[PDB]
Amino acid sequence: MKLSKDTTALLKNFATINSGIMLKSGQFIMTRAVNGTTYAEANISDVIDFDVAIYDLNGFLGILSLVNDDAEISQSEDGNIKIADARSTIFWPAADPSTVVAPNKPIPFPVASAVTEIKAEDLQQLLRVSRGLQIDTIAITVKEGKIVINGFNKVEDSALTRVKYSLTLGDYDGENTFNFIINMANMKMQPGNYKLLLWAKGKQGAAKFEGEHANYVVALEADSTHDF
Amino acid sequence: MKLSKDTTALLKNFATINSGIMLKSGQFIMTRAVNGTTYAEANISDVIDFDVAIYDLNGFLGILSLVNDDAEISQSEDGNIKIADARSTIFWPAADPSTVVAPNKPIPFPVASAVTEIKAEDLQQLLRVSRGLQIDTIAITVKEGKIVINGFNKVEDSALTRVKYSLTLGDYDGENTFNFIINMANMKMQPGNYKLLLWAKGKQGAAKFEGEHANYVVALEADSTHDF
Amino acid sequence: MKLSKDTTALLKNFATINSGIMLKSGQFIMTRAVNGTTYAEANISDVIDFDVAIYDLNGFLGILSLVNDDAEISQSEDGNIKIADARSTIFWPAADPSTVVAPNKPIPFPVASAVTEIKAEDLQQLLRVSRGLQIDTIAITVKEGKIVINGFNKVEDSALTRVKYSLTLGDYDGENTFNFIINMANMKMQPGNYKLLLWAKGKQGAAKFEGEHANYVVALEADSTHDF
Amino acid sequence: MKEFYISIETVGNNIVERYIDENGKERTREVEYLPTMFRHCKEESKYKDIYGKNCAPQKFPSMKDARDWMKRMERIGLEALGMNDFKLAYISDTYGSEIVYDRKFVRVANCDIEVTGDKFPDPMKAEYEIDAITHYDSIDDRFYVFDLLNSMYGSVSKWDAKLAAKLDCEGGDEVPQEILDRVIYMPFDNERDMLMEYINLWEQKRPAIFTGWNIEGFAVPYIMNRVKMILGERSMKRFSPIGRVKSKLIQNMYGSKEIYSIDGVSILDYLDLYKKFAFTNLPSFSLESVAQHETKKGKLPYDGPINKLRETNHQRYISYNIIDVESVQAIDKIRGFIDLVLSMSYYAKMPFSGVMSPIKTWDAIIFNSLKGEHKVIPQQGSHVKQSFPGAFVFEPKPIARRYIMSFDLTSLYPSIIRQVNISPETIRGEFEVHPIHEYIAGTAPKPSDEYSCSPNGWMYDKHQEGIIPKEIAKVFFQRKDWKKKMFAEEMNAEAIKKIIMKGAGSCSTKPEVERYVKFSDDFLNELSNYTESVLNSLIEECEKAATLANTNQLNRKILINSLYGALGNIHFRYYDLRNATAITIFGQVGIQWIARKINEYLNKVCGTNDEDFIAAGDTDSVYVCVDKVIEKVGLDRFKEQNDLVEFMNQFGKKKMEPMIDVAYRELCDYMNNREHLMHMDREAISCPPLGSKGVGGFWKAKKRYALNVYDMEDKRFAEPHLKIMGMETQQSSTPKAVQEALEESIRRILQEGEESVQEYYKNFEKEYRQLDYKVIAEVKTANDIAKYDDKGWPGFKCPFHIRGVLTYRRAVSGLGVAPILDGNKVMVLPLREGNPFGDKCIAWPSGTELPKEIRSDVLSWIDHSTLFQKSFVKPLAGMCESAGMDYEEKASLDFLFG
DNA sequence: AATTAAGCAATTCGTAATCATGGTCATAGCT
DNA sequence: AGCTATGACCATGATTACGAATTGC
């Protein structure tokens, strides 16, 4: 089996949120936050024949990048991972699936209370300003019928009353109103154009970003307000 | 206001000399440092229309580089700074005039006691190599009827004698003789050609590195001697 | 002097071997490990006319790379080294010859037991994987009639029984058997195609990598075995 | 001359007591003492306990019987009182009254062994043979010097007095001839006769008190180990007066410390004495260094290994040993320490070794005092060590304050003890504690009006005096009486001196003079008619009386200053954690209270508001800033600096001092304390020289300040003198040359101004390169090099001077030079770039010199710059920047940008 | 057999670990 | 061939802890 460059990039993006991962057979890749505040999944074009728990994923992608994409991954003789190349052989141990934190099954996403789209440039600039403005809280809401996102520093501004950053995403023609608070560390998505869905039930609330390769699900702060 | 990328780079250098700044309406910028040994002035292509003080210029310039150049900058409704983009808006707190050191007024540099010209390559070499040899201090003096520079290391040679680095500057047809010594820490001009205007009287002179994009002013050290 | 940038690269790769170096007059450059397990020699197309020993090779090669390539090198009027380009003259200090570990004479080493050839990219890949997997040591050996190199870690696999990485040099022409163990902290060679020369008598042994510019000699470890 | 004890010990159930008779002969005896303790009894008895409960006496025929009784008594968990240590009880019963002693009845022995070997003589090893011994006896005032002629490490010629008296330029040893006039030489070709002679001299001339420079460090152990290994056990046993010499090996974490106690003789070291009563730390603690510090006397310098000195010069070897013992005796004579401990022990009636612990002597003196009032001493109860809060310290603003006035409390802790009437028995209960900041502002209500309260939250009995305050009053009264006697004797001596210089008489009969009294004018006129010899005899008698009075007063001062450390300790007999916590908490409360009051009054007088005039301070000492008062009056009116000094003196003495006093009267009113006692006094006047752009004074942190003092107390200084405290000048760590130059720089900033600082900085910069390498080194201290010793290279988290020590040991291992150990200050030096040793620092024993094979190598690689900037430049920058000064004129664009 | 013995608050430097910050040569990219 | 942007690497600085050392109330 071989992993294409896009698959390597996607799993690199996925390592940004969880230390470990499960490699299940097929063409589906899953990952969940270690504290379970964020979720992600994707579909690859490579057929997987075996499942393996990986703990040091960043090193794994580093060593994979150093070799050509035609290298084969197999089950080693000692219950571990073997990488076979034309002239080089690597033995990377397989971690215990018990200790690796991952979902036991895919989680379908229910109907969305709110629907909009976000451009790649929007994601890039918001992540960059979050780094630069050392933001910790983002309040996604609707102002003047426009679904927008604002940035608030919860530690300094516990009342989120000072809009240091703002960005308009789309036009929402609905009396439904909402304001969802999210921590930055949940935001680990790779750059790209995405579609944003919001779904909340009372105290419960969640968001979902869908892209052409991978999808993410983000938990919300309990202080979020909403009337649907 | 719209700040062109060249103005951003000039502001970045003026940040390197001083982390904070104040500015008045116009196209002329003047910035000092806390220690008072350095001064800088310039006339940017753009024009400032509202006076404002910025405390942390590094993040300011970073976020402005993150956003589009066309994005307008102005003073916010609360007295702070607001920048509007095609789809986003950012807010930055306004630094008070007292909380950021600022230069009082444009400096009337008197008639130059001596004048020469330095090319960009030589200045780049001096700045890049003074760190390699721990060349703390530089001297510009009259050797064999020509003005030249030589590097002295203060940390080990308090007597200012051990010649380590020495660069020919150019001719000097003057009966006067001088030995100006300058701390490398104040040598912070942006890479480029400069015309040195060196003045001195009593016990304190100055050096004016004038260039097409800005002029820098550096204090001289008491060790500096001159005879006219 | 006038040293090509290739000469500067050779000097820089030599600096990672020993902190300092001597410079005998001629076209021959050599140095050896402080613990003496590694030695490097080379022929330089540039000409050396005088000898001088310097301890701080890294800074010297850095400043030499900094100056214009047309510059010339000589010995100072104060027993130091002076390098002068078109407009600037620099005085890099010279060192007391006692401090530098000076190899007395190159090792001719005519005969050896095994020979093979390793490609540049394979060497690069194995160095990178050794960096990634903390592979402290390798062993060149013969299996299934194949000259191969297998990497292991002493601090974890003290017995060196479990292979962590494998690379096959090729087939073995001879019938003699051996297994030479070489610490990875010795590998400092420039990235390039090499010819590998293995020799071993009783307790002592030697591994040589021959390149188009420089050749490297290293001593095998106490567990290296050989029978011919 | 009444009999008084010399030493007391316990053997079996008998007490052996060596002592002096009426005519002055040292003799011993044994007494089968009869222990007599007390137990709690319901029946009324004359001897009641501390709280008034009755106690019935109980007598035993032996100490063992009483100990077993106490064991079975503590087994049933019932309280039994009395004095546990039967030695104290016996020695108190034997004498009871005061003791009068003489220094000619006590044998002070100062010994020293010089032994050569290939390696440092280890007392644990005891491998080499003692080829030089010196033993000075005080009563004989004679040095006994024994020299080994033939040894496996070398054979030498016989020592000469005349040659040892010759000059070095003439090949001699410059030993004072008055010393060899008191020197007896017993050379021996063999070690056996040497040892036998020393043993029998020890037995015939048995010293009452044994002391020496680090004696228990090497002198005692090595001798006893050698005699043990050469002559089995009887050798050491017979050394002891009663065949009782006991090993007390203190195996610390790093190494071993064999301690040998010779029972019957008060084995007391002298290095510890200088490290306990001198209150001054030197860059070295070698005998040579302290001798140079005390007697200015410099032994003829020697270059090379000590052991190799014998093989080149035996004469100078013996001369050095003799002169070093002489120096020990001389520093004791000028300091007066052995007499001090003897006086203390005799006053408190306890064994001599009891001087080593303030707990012991305070326990003994309280036992004596309670026996005088017919009470019963309680037994000691178990406790656990707990760290109560300590002394509050202000945080000064690191800004150079020009005018500072110092004020202080005199003997704060005893004054608190007596004023609050605190004692383990006076405890009555606890009150509702209020937040401290209420008390500091005088807002919390009165905790109680019937018992004396303490802001730790307690109320203790009123009216009734506390026993500890009783003894405090006793010692204070004795102290002031002794000081008045001292003043009287000083006046008598001055009057006799002025009479003599005016003119003497012609009466050659010496009259009787009453000690410790002031001479009347008629008495002086009578004494004016005597011959010069009689006048000199009276002068020397008065001087000796003054010395005895000084010893008494200083012993009292040590007692009072040590009582505070005595009270808080688990092993102390009258220990009471609540009491000590009360004392320290009350101290903090009082100092913060007066701080607030001072700020209030200064805001009132100066007219400003919420201004912190109190510069800084800690317990019993507060420095305030009063420059605002000077500004209010103005500096122009003062024609001279002394005018300003006397003006501020009058202002301190007459204007605020009554305010402080009334504030403390109000304090004692607020509390229910028995009696107001916190007398505050002005301490020192700090001010810059008039007209000079100097700064006057500055600070750096808590307990860090430099004040140009013009008049400390009332002793007006003609020129101002600096009272620097805490800064790097006082620190031993700073090198001597750097220390002196730094002190001069501090004087310049305080007095002249910045420009002098910069000029002297430049001068020191140009001189520092050409200085002697001996006077530029951090000294620090090596403790447990083994903890960081790992095969000639530094270990993990290796301290700097220990790294230098390891480098030095690498350099000189196998060179046979004096090695470096714990306690020995190790002067370190930095090494630049590539040093042959292989590291950036090298450290040698303080005072010593490097042997010439490495001297050139060290001087060729001394990193002048790093040390110059990390020892002198850095602290100087800290000080000046704390004082608004720059040591190097930097300037700016003020010419134009301004 | 004696129990084995001033107290606490404070300051400074070096080491070490550890992260963050920043040039910089290394690498992918368009003119 | 050269400016432009990105990127880990390596240096370095800043912090913070810790221990060792030393006064002074």
Residue numbers in the entry:
A (entry chain B), B (entry chain D), C (entry chain E): 1 to 228
D (entry chain A): 1 to 898
Which of the paper's sentences describe this entry?
The sliding clamp plays a crucial role by encircling the DNA double helix and anchoring the polymerase to the template. Sequence analysis reveals that T4 polymerase contains three main structural regions: an N-terminal domain, a 3′-5′ exonuclease domain responsible for proofreading activity, and a C-terminal polymerase domain. The T4 gp45 sliding clamp forms a trimeric ring structure, with each of the three monomers composed of structurally similar N-terminal and C-terminal domains (NTD and CTD).
Three mutations (D75R, Q430E, and K432E) were incorporated into the gp43(exo-) polymerase to break two critical salt bridges (Asp75:Arg244 and Lys432:Asp118) and eliminate one hydrogen bond (Gln430:Glu127) within the dimer interface. Following successful expression and purification of this dimer-interface mutant, size exclusion chromatography demonstrated that the complexes assembled with the dimer-interface mutant polymerase exhibited delayed elution compared to those containing the gp43(exo-) polymerase. This elution shift indicated effective disruption of the polymerase dimer interface, yielding T4 holoenzyme complexes with only one polymerase. Cryo-EM analysis provided additional confirmation, with 2D class averages clearly showing the presence of only one polymerase. We subsequently determined the cryo-EM structure of this one-polymerase T4 holoenzyme at an overall resolution of 4.0 Å. A striking feature of this structure is the altered orientation of the sliding clamp, which tilts downward 26° relative to its position in the two-polymerase complex, positioning it perpendicular to the DNA. The primer 3′-terminus occupies the polymerization active site, suggesting an active conformation, although the finger domain remains open in anticipation of an incoming nucleotide binding. This structure thus defines the canonical T4 polymerase holoenzyme architecture, in which a single polymerase associates with the sliding clamp that adopts a largely perpendicular orientation relative to the DNA. The resulting structure shows the clamp positioned perpendicular to the DNA, consistent with other B-family holoenzyme structures. This perpendicular arrangement allows the sliding clamp to move along the DNA on a thin film of water molecules known as the “water skating” mechanism.
